[PDB]
């Protein structure tokens, strides 16, 4: 869709607000909120992926962030 | 661009709304404002609006009594006043002013909408 | 016959102590069931109906916009109000605007503003709901006989059509000449409609997941509405612009109707115009051949010539297909149909039009056969006019092999822990299967749900390199087990 | 001012005309007179064939369904060149006069014109002397790299790449038919539900996804003169001529 | 928008045809290419900052991959 | 039921495209066939087509010169004969038989469609 | 396959790889040739014309 | 062009003459031939390259020949 390709990191950006900053700015967090509320065995498999593959908490947090915030992404 | 309501009769007790048709940059730059002036008697100030904010300002008298709104999709000023009664016929003019609180410069007035209180 | 020509056939040999087999019918699939002494059936699902449904949303997907009002207080003032506000038909928001002695208010600062607009919706989608009681599956069942009127046809004139209800899951079809057919199916355990919803746009339907439809940002309204007025998330096909901080406008979204079928993607279409008909799906039922009967086994060999009417023809199965008429004097008799090698010693194939007969002496009869691989010729007639046909079968049988295991992998794949119901009679290591498989499958919808085929292939890599690179040997087995099978699934699945 | 047409983008469409053709198996590829025209948006796929549905072969047979693009509804988008990039500019000096305090045309508010044609602007206000204006109109917003996206009276401000990387039906710009859709086969789908039949539908109308793709751009006005009220503009003030008016 | 939930991993997919599953099934993968060519700079910050991240091959290849994928997803 | 276009008048090595538009349940499930006959002389099967599926089917005397296409979007099957000529001027026929390549029997027909190469 | 009153036995995915424009055999038009990039050449020697 | 697809290999081949089989067996050979003779620097570079890459003779031999083939071919 167009709507997977929006028009931001653009570097246009003037001190004029954008077409739907205040909407666009949190619905990314929210559509990651919602899926993760809805499916938790998913959420549970990362952690433990996330803990298996990294040997650092460093690296085992942003596994785990990456992988909850790619699976919805790419879904 | 003051176009304003038909002289409409009404009776005691009701109220009558009437209306002012402005222009797109009448609606936007300037603020209306509804002067009545009873037949045989002096003008006089009821309030006004600044339509693209919306918050209208009545006089002493009518407040409590009054109402202005405004149509943003229209571009309308509508004056609206209930509990009619015999002191109240007159003929209603909407007038245009600068939104600037000091500048009270009436340019440009409308037709004149004349309102009757009588049960006929 | 009609099974000829679907290239997503099924061939179901064999019955349990009770003359009973397990059968799942899916609508673009075709099965053929044989057993030893019965006549061969195919078996297709061509309908499936929801009835009554009841609406439980209407998403907005295309609105406009009439009637805005404004309203604002001078700065320190607090927040203004507007009648609407409180009016659901209205959509409303609260901004601060820059006021001062231009614009008419005798204090500087940010005063509060509130804009308004009469929301009104110009097309929406119904999200219809059917009780699970109310689907009904239409199964026709066709005697694999050979007779001309059924060699791959889509019609009824010979077909049986036995319709399957939640309530009435049980039903027999009298075929004419074969005795009957009794089904016993269950429909409730075959698509679980309770969690789904009809979603009708326009002139297009889909299937859809009822936590997914009552989870879409768009505005809705209960379904028991009938002026609208009362849509919920107005907010979401509106936007609200304060650009700088001068005015505040309100603007609606545009149709969403193309936005709503990228969303739909991964959700199968249906049809819901002259009634909700559903063709995908499955239905599990148990084939009970007990009252069915070959029709002529006594009769007596034909003893005639036969011609080949129209040459041999190899379906996508590895069976062939051949149409002889007869020209003998004994008119109802089995035709001897053999599948030999050259020197006529051994019988290499199998014939799936089992026992076929001439019930009329100028009416063509096409047999279905499964030949052997190799060379191999079919022998119509008997010696005074013998017709010897020779045919050649281009696969392997390890590749046969290969292929019936891909099959059953993607059944699995697709079914799930229903595919151990696709051919069953019962025993125990079907059972213990079947119940291994719900587990897992539990445990795998759990975490996997909701997730795209990509991520599925990229979870199944990084569960094999885990597995792989691990220093217990069954921790390492089970790993890499469970990855490449996540693999597959991801390469396997449409989503 | 004059702005040029890159490209026009369809967001609705519909579909006639819808012809299918279909060869028996082995039988290679089959042909439609319609797949000649570029108005067709046209697919090819596999069904199964057999004697039941008029093969003597029994295996996938190839099937081309072909329907007649009509684009309905444009998202057209315009580029200008930095010289014709006039902008406003309201000079008003702090007295206590208040005449033009307020005031947005004339008056104490003198307002001028700045085009990259002239460097120097030069505003006489009453009173006070001269102003001289030195703006750079060109380094300001880079309109070389910019769209002006116009759909459904309104208009958007985007990155002239993020624009050609659109995935929609387009025209060149330059086209005068309206009829050579380019990209036509991300507004249509072809459906091949259990390979027995193929069909062809125009998959909606995209004007909400475009507005959900306009995400991040500033609105601007193009329903008359393409104005923009967005960005900025660098420059050097000069007030050798400038005098206190009471003085 | 509605697009961006697009009723994929839901489970109800039998042997039939979902709707614009053809193009469904490589949209996202052509998207983060086309990404990834427009915007080849983060993709360099994001192999530097893997490799930093990451002490193994693997995760350090499993964190460049996952931020590239998210990267143009968060948008 | 089964429509034919009405009777067209050409000229030699001109074009004539004669259509038959069909229910959709005939569209969709069925096989129409294109019959000419000459005046006083017997049928002539020309060719056939399965709407559904497309890829019609021509006779060897009209290979080469006949197009056969059907319309899914209007339900209607259409006939060109290109170069035509005086031997070609004939009543065409349209008629509706099951898409099985077995059975020919042709149940339901066109009133047809007469092609003259002379003047009326 | 033929060519000009001559014939011979080929290859058929051979036969379907031969970088030349082609129809698709159930044609009857003979004018919407596939890969016609394989039997002409474009010129621009100098981006001066094409 | 098609004549760089001759229909060689195929598998097809009988006891029958083929098309131009007597003319075809040897013109490969002529062809290699004929370049080596008119660029013979290749050849002495591609002799060097050999000796310097191949270990044993039979590998220096077979990358020579190798490379001395291709030359022709690729152009
Ligand atoms: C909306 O405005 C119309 C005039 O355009 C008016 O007739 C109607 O009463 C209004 N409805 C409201 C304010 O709810
Ligand atoms: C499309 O069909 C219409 C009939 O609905 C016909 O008049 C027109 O000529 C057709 N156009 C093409 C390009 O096939």
């Known amino acids: 869709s167009v709507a997977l390709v929006p028009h931001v990191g653009m570097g246009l950006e003037t001190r004029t607000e954008t077409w739907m900053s205040s909407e666009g700015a949190w619905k990314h967090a929210q559509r990651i909120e919602t899926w993760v509320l809805r499916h938790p065995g998913f959420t549970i498999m990362a952690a433990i992926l996330a803990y298996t593959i990294g040997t650092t908490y460093f690296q085992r947090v942003l596994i785990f962030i990456l992988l909850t915030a790619v699976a919805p992404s790419m879904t | 661009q003051l176009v304003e309501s038909g002289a409409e009769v009404k009776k005691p007790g009701s109220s009558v709304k009437v209306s002012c048709?402005?222009?797109?940059?009448?609606?936007?730059?300037?603020?209306?404002?509804?002067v009545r002036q009873a037949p045989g008697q002096g003008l006089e100030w009821?309030?006004?609006?600044?339509?693209?904010?919306?918050?209208?300002?009545?006089?002493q008298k009518f407040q409590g009594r009054v109402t202005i709104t405004a149509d943003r999709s229209t571009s309308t000023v509508y004056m609206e006043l209930s509990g009619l009664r015999s002191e109240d016929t007159a003929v209603?003019?909407?007038?245009?002013?600068?939104?600037?609180?000091?500048?009270?410069?009436?340019?440009?007035?409308?037709?004149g909408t004349l309102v009757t209180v009588s049960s006929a | 016959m009609r099974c000829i020509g679907i290239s997503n056939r099924d061939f179901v040999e064999g019955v349990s102590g009770g003359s009973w087999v397990d059968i799942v019918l899916e609508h673009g699939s075709c099965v053929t069931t044989m057993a030893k002494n019965k006549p061969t059936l195919d078996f297709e699902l061509i309908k499936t109906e929801a009835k009554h449904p009841a609406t439980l949303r209407k998403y907005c997907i295309e609105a406009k916009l009439t009637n805005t009002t404004t309203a604002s207080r001078c700065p320190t003032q607090g927040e203004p109000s507007l009648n609407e506000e409180q009016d659901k038909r209205f959509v409303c928001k609260h901004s601060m605007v820059d006021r001062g002695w231009g614009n008419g208010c005798g204090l500087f600062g940010k005063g509060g503003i509130v804009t308004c607009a009469m929301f009104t919706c110009k097309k929406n989608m119904e999200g219809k709901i059917v009780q699970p009681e109310n689907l009904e599956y239409t199964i026709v069942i066709t005697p694999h006989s050979g007779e001309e009127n059924a060699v791959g046809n889509d019609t009824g004139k010979h077909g049986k059509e036995i319709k399957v209800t939640p309530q009435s899951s049980i039903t027999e079809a009298e075929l004419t000449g074969y005795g009957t057919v009794t089904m016993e199916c269950s429909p409730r355990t075959g698509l679980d409609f309770n969690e789904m919803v009809l979603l009708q746009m326009e002139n297009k339907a889909w299937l859809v997941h009822r936590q997914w439809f009552l989870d879409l940002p768009l505005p809705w309204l209960p379904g028991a509405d009938t002026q609208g007025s009362n849509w919920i998330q107005k907010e979401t096909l509106v936007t609200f612009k304060n650009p700088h901080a001068k005015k505040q406008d309100v603007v609606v979204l545009g149709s969403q109707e193309g936005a709503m079928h990228t969303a739909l993607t991964g959700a199968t279409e249906i049809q819901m115009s002259s009634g909700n008909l559903l063709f995908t799906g499955h239905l599990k039922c148990r084939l009970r051949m007990d009252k069915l009967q070959l029709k002529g086994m006594s009769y007596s060999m034909c003893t005639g010539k036969f011609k080949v009417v129209k040459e041999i023809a190899e379906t996508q199965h590895g069976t062939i297909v051949i149409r002889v008429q007869y020209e003998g004097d004994g008119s109802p008799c089995k035709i001897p149909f053999e599948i030999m090698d050259l020197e006529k010693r051994h019988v290499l194939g199998r014939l799936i039009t089992v026992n076929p007969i001439v019930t009329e002496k100028d009416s063509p009869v096409n047999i279905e056969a499964e030949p052997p691989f190799g060379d191999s010729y079919i022998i119509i007639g008997v010696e005074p006019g013998q017709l010897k046909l020779s045919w050649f079968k281009k696969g392997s049988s390890i590749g046969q092999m290969f292929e019936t295991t891909m099959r059953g992998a993607k059944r699995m794949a697709i079914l799930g822990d229903t595919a151990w119901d696709f051919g069953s009679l019962g025993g125990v290591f079907t059972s213990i299967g079947k119940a291994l498989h719900q587990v897992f499958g539990a445990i795998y919808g759990a975490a996997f749900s909701g997730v795209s085929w990509t991520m599925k292939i990229l979870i199944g890599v990084v569960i094999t390199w885990i597995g792989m690179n691990s220093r217990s040997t069954s921790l390492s087995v089970s790993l890499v087990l469970v990855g490449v099978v996540t693999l597959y699934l991801g390469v396997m699945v449409q989503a | 001012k004059h702005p040029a047409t890159l490209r026009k983008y369809c967001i609705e469409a519909k579909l006639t005309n819808t012809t299918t053709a279909s060869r028996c198996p082995t039988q290679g590829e089959p042909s439609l007179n319609e797949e000649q025209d570029k108005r067709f948006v046209c697919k090819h796929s596999m069904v199964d064939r057999g004697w039941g549905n008029g093969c003597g072969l029994f295996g996938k047979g190839g099937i081309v369904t072909c329907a007649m693009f009509t684009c309905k509804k444009n998202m057209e988008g315009k580029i200008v060149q930095p010289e014709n990039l006039e902008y406003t500019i309201v000079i008003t000096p702090h007295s206590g006069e208040e005449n033009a305090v307020g005031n947005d045309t004339g008056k104490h508010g003198k307002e001028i014109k700045v085009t990259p044609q002239s460097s120097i602007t030069e505003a006489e206000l009453t009173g006070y002397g001269t102003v001289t204006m030195e703006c750079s109109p060109r380094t300001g917003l880079d309109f070389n790299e910019m769209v002006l996206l116009q759909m459904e009276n309104k208009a958007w401000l985007v990155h002239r790449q993020w624009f050609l990387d659109l995935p929609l039906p387009w025209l060149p710009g330059a086209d005068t038919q309206g009829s050579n859709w380019i990209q036509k086969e991300t507004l249509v789908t072809f459906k091949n539900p259990h390979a027995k039949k193929q069909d062809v539908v125009v998959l909606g109308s995209q004007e909400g996804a475009m507005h959900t793709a306009l995400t991040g751009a500033t609105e601007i006005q193009m329903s008359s003169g393409n104005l923009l009220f967005t960005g900025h503009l660098k420059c050097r003030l000069r007030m050798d001529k400038l005098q206190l008016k009471g003085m | 928008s509605v697009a961006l939930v697009p009723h994929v991993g839901m489970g109800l997919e039998t042997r039939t045809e979902t709707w614009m599953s053809s193009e469904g099934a490589w949209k996202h993968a052509q998207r983060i290419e086309t990404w990834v060519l427009r915007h080849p700079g983060f993709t360099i910050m994001a192999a530097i900052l893997a490799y930093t991240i990451g002490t193994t091959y693997f995760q350090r290849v499993l964190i460049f991959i996952l931020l590239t994928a998210v990267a143009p997803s968060m948008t | 039921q089964l429509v034919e276009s009405g009777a067209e008048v050409k000229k030699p090595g001109s074009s004539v495209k004669v259509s038959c538009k069909a229910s959709?349940?005939?569209?969709?499930?069925?096989?129409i066939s294109w019959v000419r006959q000459a005046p006083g002389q017997g049928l002539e099967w020309m060719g056939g087509?399965?709407?559904?599926?497309?890829?019609?089917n021509y006779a060897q005397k009209f290979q080469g010169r006949v197009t056969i296409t059907a319309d899914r979007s209007t339900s209607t099957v259409y006939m060109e004969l290109s170069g035509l000529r005086s031997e070609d001027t004939a009543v065409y026929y349209c008629?509706?038989?099951?898409?099985?390549?077995?059975?020919?029997?042709?149940?339901?027909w066109g009133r047809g469609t007469l092609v003259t190469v002379s003047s009326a | 396959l033929q060519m000009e009153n001559k014939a011979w036995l080929v290859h058929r995915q051979w036969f379907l790889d031969l970088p030349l424009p082609w129809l698709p055999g159930a044609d009857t038009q003979g004018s919407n040739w596939i890969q016609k990039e394989t039997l002409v050449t474009f010129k621009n020697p100098h981006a001066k014309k094409q | 062009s098609v004549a760089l697809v001759p229909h060689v290999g195929m598998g097809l081949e009988t006891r029958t003459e083929t098309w131009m089989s007597s003319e075809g067996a040897w013109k490969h050979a002529q062809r290699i031939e004929t370049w080596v003779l008119r660029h013979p620097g290749f050849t002495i570079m591609a002799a060097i390259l050999a000796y310097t890459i191949g270990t044993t003779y039979f590998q220096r031999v077979l990358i020579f020949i190798l490379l001395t083939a291709v030359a022709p071919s690729m152009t």
């Open positions: 008629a509706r038989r099951p898409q099985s390549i077995f059975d020919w029997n042709f149940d339901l």
């Open positions: 959709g349940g005939t569209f969709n499930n069925y096989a």
């Open positions: 087509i399965i709407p559904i599926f497309g890829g019609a």
